[PDB]
Structures are given as structure tokens and as C-alpha cells.
Amino acid sequence: DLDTHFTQYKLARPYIADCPNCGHSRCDSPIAIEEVRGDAHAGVIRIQTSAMFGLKTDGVDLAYMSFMNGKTQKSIKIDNLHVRTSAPCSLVSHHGYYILAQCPPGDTVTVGFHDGPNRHTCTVAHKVEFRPVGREKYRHPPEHGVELPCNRYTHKRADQGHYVEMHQPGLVADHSLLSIHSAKVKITVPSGAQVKYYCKCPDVREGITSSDHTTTCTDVKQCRAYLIDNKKWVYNSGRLPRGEGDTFKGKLHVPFVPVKAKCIATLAPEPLVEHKHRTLILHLHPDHPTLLTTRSLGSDANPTRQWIERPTTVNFTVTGEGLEYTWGNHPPKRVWAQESGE
Amino acid sequence: DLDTHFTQYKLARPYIADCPNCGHSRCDSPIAIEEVRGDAHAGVIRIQTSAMFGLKTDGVDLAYMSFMNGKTQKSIKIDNLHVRTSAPCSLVSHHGYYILAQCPPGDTVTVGFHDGPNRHTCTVAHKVEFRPVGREKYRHPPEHGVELPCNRYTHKRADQGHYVEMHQPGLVADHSLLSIHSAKVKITVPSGAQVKYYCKCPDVREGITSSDHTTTCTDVKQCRAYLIDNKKWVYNSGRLPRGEGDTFKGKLHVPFVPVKAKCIATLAPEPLVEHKHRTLILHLHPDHPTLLTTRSLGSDANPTRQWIERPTTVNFTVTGEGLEYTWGNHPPKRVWAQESGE
Amino acid sequence: DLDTHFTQYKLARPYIADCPNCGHSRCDSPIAIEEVRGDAHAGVIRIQTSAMFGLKTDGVDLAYMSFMNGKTQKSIKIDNLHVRTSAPCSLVSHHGYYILAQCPPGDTVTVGFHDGPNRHTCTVAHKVEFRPVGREKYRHPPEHGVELPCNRYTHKRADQGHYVEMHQPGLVADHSLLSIHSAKVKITVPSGAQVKYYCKCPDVREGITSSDHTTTCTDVKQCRAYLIDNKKWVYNSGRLPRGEGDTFKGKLHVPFVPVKAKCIATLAPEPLVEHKHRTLILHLHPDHPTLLTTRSLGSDANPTRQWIERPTTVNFTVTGEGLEYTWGNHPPKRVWAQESGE
Amino acid sequence: YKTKVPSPVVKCCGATQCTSKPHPDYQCQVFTGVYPFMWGGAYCFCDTENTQMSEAYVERSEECSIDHAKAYKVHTGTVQAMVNITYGSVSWRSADVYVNGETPAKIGDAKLIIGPLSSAWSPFDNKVVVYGHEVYNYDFPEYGTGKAGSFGDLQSRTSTSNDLYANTNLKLQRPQAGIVHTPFTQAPSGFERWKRDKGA
DSSP states (O other): OOOSOHHHHTTBOOOOOOOSSBTTBOOOOTTOEEEEEOOSSSSEEEEEESSOOBSOSSSOOTTEEEEEETTEEEEEEOTTOEEESSSBOEEEEEETTEEEEEOOOEEEEEEEOOOSSOOOEEEEEEEEOOOOSSSBOOSSOOSSSOEEEOOEEOSOOOOOSOEEEOOOOOOOBOTTSOEEOSSSEEOOOSSSOBOOOOBSSSSOOSOOSSSOOOSSOOOGGGBOOBOBOTTSBOOOOTTSOOOTTOOOOOEEEOSOOEEOOEEEOOOOOOOEEEEETTEEEEEEOOSSOEEEEEOOOSSSOOOEEEEEOSOEEEEEEOOSSOEEEOOTTSOOEEEOOOOOOO | OOOSOHHHHTTBOOOOOOOSSBTTBOOOOTTOEEEEEOOSSSSEEEEEESSOOBSOSSSOOTTEEEEEETTEEEEEEOTTOEEESSSBOEEEEEETTEEEEEOOOEEEEEEEOOOSSOOOEEEEEEEEOOOOSSSBOOSSOOSSSOEEEOOEEOSOOOOOSOEEEOOOOOOOBOTTSOEEOSSSEEOOOSSSOBOOOOBSSSSOOSOOSSSOOOSSOOOGGGBOOBOBOTTSBOOOOTTSOOOTTOOOOOEEEOSOOEEOOEEEOOOOOOOEEEEETTEEEEEEOOSSOEEEEEOOOSSSOOOEEEEEOSOEEEEEEOOSSOEEEOOTTSOOEEEOOOOOOO | OOOSOHHHHTTBOOOOOOOSSBTTBOOOOTTOEEEEEOOSSSSEEEEEESSOOBSOSSSOOTTEEEEEETTEEEEEEOTTOEEESSSBOEEEEEETTEEEEEOOOEEEEEEEOOOSSOOOEEEEEEEEOOOOSSSBOOSSOOSSSOEEEOOEEOSOOOOOSOEEEOOOOOOOBOTTSOEEOSSSEEOOOSSSOBOOOOBSSSSOOSOOSSSOOOSSOOOGGGBOOBOBOTTSBOOOOTTSOOOTTOOOOOEEEOSOOEEOOEEEOOOOOOOEEEEETTEEEEEEOOSSOEEEEEOOOSSSOOOEEEEEOSOEEEEEEOOSSOEEEOOTTSOOEEEOOOOOOO | OBOOOOOOEEESSSOOOOOOOSSTTOEEEEEEOOOOBOSSSOOOSOSSSOEEEEEEOOBOOSGGGTSOEEEEEOOOOOOOBOOBOOOTTTOOOBOOBOOSTTOOOOSSSOOOOOOOOSOOOOSSOSEEEEETTEEEOOOOOOTTTOOTTSSOSEEESSSSOSOEEEOOOOEEOOOSTTBOOOOEEOOOOTTTTTSSSOOO
């Protein structure tokens, strides 16, 4: 059932916005990255391109690829997507404007497909990290260890847990329109779309027309090449110009809700328990920085906290009634230290 | 002489095991990575894929590529191998199940070829570093500097210095076998291989057969799709199910022995020697963190150690009889400091 | 006007030198990297390959690609260039031997195109960073913020601000020449080029010839396979053997001059000004490490400096006459703190 | 600096004595015992008489023209001001003046004599370094002396000045294992530092 979210698919178009460091510098990429969310734990980021990949223009195959080239879409194959950061990421799934991808940490986020003639990427700043949930501060999820309640995004699309406003596009520039009528500047239209037109000189002042000419002005560089083409709504990017007329409809879901997955998760190597008189020597040797902590169960709590990444023999003045001990997200231990001094 | 280790080649097959974060998550890749060894110095790691690249199924060309697709091999070209870590590695050589590759440091290890229709990679956690041998703590081998006795793996295959046990595979699942005989679940066989079969219901209880049917059960999901196909042994991966019958033969070498190569190796920029009265001022300025140390040659040793990465003017109270001075793996200096106070 | 620097184009050839860690190890790549310059601010590095991409051998299209294969050029398309570092860089422009590319920081620099049959890359060590100009220590240029006078290289070629010496090549080895005349070692010539020849035995002692034979010696491995082919000059790489004859002409410009561009540049979030009695409490919260500093305008200066990356409530004993305050490259503020103690 | 290496000589059988060319900090050292792999394996047929003469001199960067610190010996000079007086009923004059106590400036209608001020604190010290806009009242060592690595390892009188002083401690080392290249072992500049371990 890839055919349950024609809310977005039929009615939304691949938006195009201003990528900030688009290979060279600020281009206008269709895959312009907004709303980077390195807020989960599972090595995953949910991203929004302004491009709406997924099904085609019409009806088929999530795994195809529709961005904007020109005023027009290009609903073709996804062949060579690349999200990346400090390292190349791993795609997880796309739906709508939105992609989920398993990334490592990275100061930035750097996205891009390959149309085939050109690289045509888009890149952005965003502070990314991946702490796993647990008192172990890994840099990456392992193959083993305990499972425990992480925060993470779904693989799936059949999703309604939230919805973001997606009303119309404003106009857009297209000076490919403003040709010349052998002495006058000549506007045309896409398909009968609504072209909003006048020039610095006095001539036609609104523009809701088929292909007009321009009686007064001559220069292409002093005219209103506009495309009110609101047959398909958009995401309400900050890098969108408002459609000044109205808040049109187009409430549209988000696929990648943050969910309470139990990540395959961390585990720190077991401790070396060593006895002394009402005292735990613990030669200790972790894999990664591990937050150890305890609770001397007297009404005097006297707890301790210390991230341990360097192997360290530590000590704990255990009392008569007991202490507990938390080697990372490994479960909490407990200890009777009554006498040992005879 | 690529034809001197048919111990492995003829008799071992490209094993398939469970990769831990196989792009998405835990797949079963033929290139499932076990025994990562970032234990040498030369930027090199020796790896074992469960896949046996090298010669083909039969007899030719180390630089071809045989992994398992299906129950079956696929002995074809190596075209687009990629080992990588934090950065893309450099292959060094492959032999058998095993590849040597020059890598930088990396929290993980991430391997993968390209069959051509699919990326089909495999990735794993492993703490990697490359200290070069020397009192300089570089991050990478230079072009110049002194040579000194590093630990490192060979390029070659004509190698017997160790051998790992490689006995049979256990069975494997293949539910492509368990078709339906229009009402009954229908098992088949690869080539007359030994298919170990029964279902939760009571029917044929061992299975050492050609293509059987199943009188009793009907559902594919309650039957024993097994392949005792022990015509070719395997590596004894932890991600192997035991061949319960026996410890069959198949003692098989390792190519990439750790050897006492003299790495092209480190060297720290020369010091600035400055005289004082029984005292060496040394304005110092390294390339990388350099472990400096000395030995005041009195029976009072009074040595010193400090990694120096930040340029630092240091001091050394030299005695009458002498001191020595070790600017990294640059050779040890020596100094007469008799009087200078007249 | 891509046709204004035939100084280099006609007269210089794609040089080939010894890359240091050419995938495996030290190869001889035509794109051998010398003179890495991570000395600007704008995320940019100017690099010299020993290869001269740009126009073809003859006259057309900067965006084509001429390296040396054999003794010979290969003036073809640039299709799949890759400069990279810790991450993949972004090309900016090429001219001559020289490329400009927008890179992130990286311990190394790692360059490479794809001829099509082979990766054929080249890599090198070089300490790279990108501080933007400003009291903010970013890691990367943003989309917004103030403009201020950075140092940076141009996009363009119409450039004369400096010129580097580019005189002849020395000879080069080519043992493809030294074939065998069925018992004697047989040298040939490229096109009538000047082949400098003799063997360890006594035979022809200079070699300025067409295809010679060798009366005396027989082994290819004891002869002078040389190519004095000084019809096109080179860059004066350190990895060049001298043309022993002379300092020929060939003074040749540099395209990518460092220029006083105003980078789109940094800006730190505004401070939270809080009043106290002759004292500025300032709860402060930057994006990146920001060098704050002040000047108590008394003839007692009493300034302060501290890079702030961690959000910090700070304090400043303002005097009667005034203080000034510099939240990063955000403009300097000023403050009247007369009394407030009534 | 820029260690703009001139391309080394490689004599194949026997020595090539180097000479001390007058380039700034012209470091040159003959080397033997090579076997230089250059595109065909080695090319010089001897094995120890293979000689390699490395030479490297210091030269101003291209950034030296534009991105460059700048020392000064700073004396006191003479202070100025664009004094507005919206005078009386005149209501305007915005004139540039001096401080020396006999200079008038008859701009507008009024004649005005200023100073000399009593507060002779030149905030500039005697010795100053200057960089783009950030001015440093630094005791720069001198032209002709600056220790390598320290500030002023390169010391050119001006940008045009072909002569300079380059104490960079540039020390060539022999290339490795019979391959063509030029080990130049050198302190990165005291202009590289002084941009990230500087003063305020």
C-alpha cells in the first residue's frame, strides 16, 4: 500500500529553494535542505528536501525521483542518491519531500543525487551527533548489547501522527519567458498558467493572461517574469516566497514520526569486582566513555558520577547496609558489605 | 605462482554470514566481516570476509571475485571493491577469504564491492588506529624519515606461518526449496545435495534425499529447509552454525602473516640546541606529538618523558658527566656539559 | 576569452611526477600534487597537479582534460574529477596545471579523476583549516552574516598578478623504447625526439638519434632509456629532474591569485544585555567559539580576551567613562555606566 | 614563505657539486646513493654514482602581496580632527584641522588654533606590527634577524623587494628509496602562527 498518501503525492510538487553552499556557493537546488533533525539516537536523520521524490508525477513506485528542472518536474529514477556528512550516510527511506537516512555524526549535512549529466547536490550546516540511549557514550551503534527505549524514526509511510501545513507556492521567477518580439519584450505562458506581469515603464499592470507582448518597455531586465502556477501546493519552506493571496488548504502529514523503538543498543564490558574491607576496588576497562554512578543506600545518599573512558581502578566506600553499582546501561548491581575486619 | 594454495581455493567456498549493519540493518552478506585486525602499524588492516574471493570456482586469476548468491557462488570480476573506514581505504591484496587493505584510523570498518545491479556492502564496528613505530605519534605514514622495525602484513600469498581451522559448514536455510506440490509442501535439491527434512507435523523425519514431497504438513513455514552441502569446507566463523556431525579436516593457512617489515617511518624536525650553564634550553617545534625523553647518566637516572605536540621551549639540568636526548625516533643525542661559569 | 593564456596552454605540457600515496603507495601519477595552499579563508584551496588540464593539446574548451599517459598526453573530457579531503571537496575552477576547489578542513589532501577504465587518483599530506575572518571560529561558511575582508582566490583566469618559472623538462625514463633487435637491445624514438643513450658496456655514448640499436650490451636493464623531449616546457616541480642543459624560457603566470574578496562571513548570535551597578552581566550563548574582548576606556585599558564556545554568563566591571564590547565580528558596542547606586 | 623548489638535478653516474646561488635562503645539498624511479622504474643505470642535487630557496608567497603582516618603527607625528562647529548663527563648518598650536584652518569663516594637546600617549608603541586591519603593538624582532618559526621568518623590505631575509631553517633531506622528490624540512611560517597563536 504505497497508494495511501495521495494527500501529498497528487497535490504537492517538488519545491525548489536556495541551497546555501550548493557545491560552489548559493544556488537554487530543488533538493534544498531545510529542517535537519539530528535529534534521534539511532544514527538516523530525518531530512526535508524541497524536492518531492517518491511516486512519479502521477501514480507509481516510491523508488522513483521527481525534482524540479525548469518550471517543470522530472519524475525519473532515484539511481544515485547521496546523503552524506563527515562520512557517506545510508539511506533509510523516502516519502514525499522527506528522507530518512542513517548518518554518522557530522558538523554539517551534505545531500545530493546524480541526475546523470551533472552531480547537482546540496549541502547545509547542522550540528549532528548520535548518543545512543544508555550510560555509554558510543559514537556508533554496535551489533550486540541490551535493547532499551531509544528515540528513532520509522521506516514506513502509513503515518499520520503529525502533519505540517503545506499550502500553495507563491510565484517564481522565470526569465526564459521574457523573450523579445523583435523589438518588444515578449512574455509567454507554461500551459495557460497565470503570469503576473508589468515592467518599470507603464504597460499591462496585473498579468493574468496567455502569451502577452509588452508595448512600452523593451529590456528583459525591467519586467515581471512571474508564475502563479498554484495547481500543486508546496512545503512551507522559509526559502519560499508567500503566495500573497490566501492560506490555501493542503494540510499534509509527516511520514517519519519519532517513535519509541528499542534500538539495538549499547553495553559496556563487565567490571572486575575485587573485595576489600567495606570497600570495592574495581579495576575497570570500558570500550567507550561510560557514565558510572552509585547510590549509598543510607539516608545519606552520597552518590557519585563520572564518565569513564580511560581504564581506571576506582574505589567505593561501601557501608553496612549496601551500595548499588551501574556499569553503564548494564543493569544495576547491588552489594552487601558487612564487616570483613574480623 | 598463484597456483600453490589450492588447499583453500579448491576446497573452501565463499561463506555467507550475518553482517551487523548491512546498509540498513542486519542482513546476511557473503562479505560478512569477522576478525578485523587493526593491530599492525603501517596503515594496514587484515580482514576476513566470509566471501572467498581470489581464483574463480575452478582455477584462474586471483583478481576475480567469488561470493555466494543463493546457495551458489558467483565467481566473476572484482571490479569495484570498497573497503573503507572514516575514509576510503586502499586495497593491498586479497587471498582466500582474506583481504589486506591500507586504511586510516576509524571507529568502524565498512566493506563492500559492487556486483553491478546492487551496492551490496557490509559494515562492522572495530576500534582502529595507526601509531607508527617511533616516539612520534603521527596519524599517517610519511614519504620520508628513518626506517625502523614496524609490524605489518605481507603483500603475498606464498605463506604458511600460521593456519586456521577450516572444517565443514553446517546446514543452511533455503526456503526457495520448499515449494508446493499443488496441495503439499514440496522440497527439492540443488544437485542431489543432502536436504535435512521434516515438518512440525509427522512426516519424513531425517531427509537424505532427492526432491521429496510432504505427505502431512502443508505450510512452508513449519518445515526443515536445510542444505547439508559439505562438498566444500568453510571458515569457522562465529556466525556459522556447526556441522553437527564431525570435525572434518580442512586445516588451511593464513596468507597475511604479520611480518617484521621496516616501515618507511617517522621523523620529527630537528631541535634547536641552545647553550646555557649546565643547562640545555631547547626551543622545540615538532610536526606531530613526539615523545621526548632523556637519561641523566649519573647513577641518579632522573629521566623525563613528555609527549610534545605543541612547540615548547624546554629545559634540562645537565650534569657534569653527561645527558642524552631523544627527539623522537631521531637517533639519541648526547652532551658534555662541564662548567661554563668560569 | 578563454584564449588569452596560450603562454601556458600551447607551451606547457601535463607534467608527471611521483605521487606519495597513490592509492597503494608511491606511484608516478600525472596529477601528482605539489603546493597545497590551505592558506586562504573561504573554504578554498588552490592546488597544482602536475597534470595540465584546461584546453586540449591544441585550442578548445577549458573544461576538457589533458594528463600524461605514456610519454603522451590524453586531452579528453574532465568527466569525473574528484578533489577531496576529510570530505569530498567542491571544484571551483581549473586553469593550466592548477585547480581551485572549495574544501573543508582536513589533515590531508586527496585528489583524483576517473579516466574511465581506472580510478587513477593521487593523494598527499597537508595540514588544512578554514578559519573565517572574524572573531568567530567557525568550521564552515554560513549563508548569512556580515561581509568583511577575507583572503580568497579568484574564479578566473585573466590573471597576471604573479608568475612562476616554468622552464623545460629534464629527460624521463621510458623502457618501452628499449626493445630487442632479436639479440641486441633496441631503442626507438617517439617522433624523432632526442633519446639520450648508452649502456653499462661501451657502445654509443650520447644518443641524439632516430631509432638506434646497441652493438655491445644486450640487457634492457643496463641502458639509458631517455627522452629529451623539450618541445613543451613544464612546471618546475621538486619532483622533476633538471633539464641539465640550460634555464630555458617559459615564465608563466598563476591564475588563482589570492585576492581581497569580502567573504560572505560569520556572525555570532546577539548577546543578552543585563544591567547591574557599574557592571554588565551578560548571559551569552554563541553558535561557535567566539573571541570576545573589551577595552575599559580609561587610560587604564584593562582589556579581556576569551574565546567563548560554551554559553556563559560573564561579567564586566564597567567604569564611569565607558567600556566597549565586541561580540565576535558583530560590530563593537559601547556603554555608559555611570552610577546606579542612588 | 613558499618553498618554491627549483627542480633538482639528477646526474646519473658521478657527482654534481652545488654552488650557493644568491636566492634568499638558498638551501642546496648534493646527494648520492639514489636510483630514481621516474615512470620507467629507475632511469640512471649506475646504483651509487646516481647523484641527486636538491636545491630550494625561500620566496614570497603570492599572498605576501596582499595578506601580509607589516612592521613599523613608530614615532609620534601629529593628530587631526574633522571639527564641526555649527557656530553661532553661522550654523556650520565641518573642517579638517591639526593639533599643533599655531595652525589655523579658515574653512567656513572662523580661524581656529588647536592644541598642542597635553596627553601625548601615543597608543601605538615604538615598534608595531600591522595586519590588514588588526594592529599589534608588537616588538617585532627586526628586518634581517627573525628566528625561523618565530614572527618574521620571512622579512622583505616591501612586496616588490626581491631581496629579503629568510631564516626558515630550511633543511633539505635526501629523497627516499630511489625516487624523485625533494624533502624540504622547514618550519611553517611565523606568519602562519601569528594568525592563530597571536596577541590581541
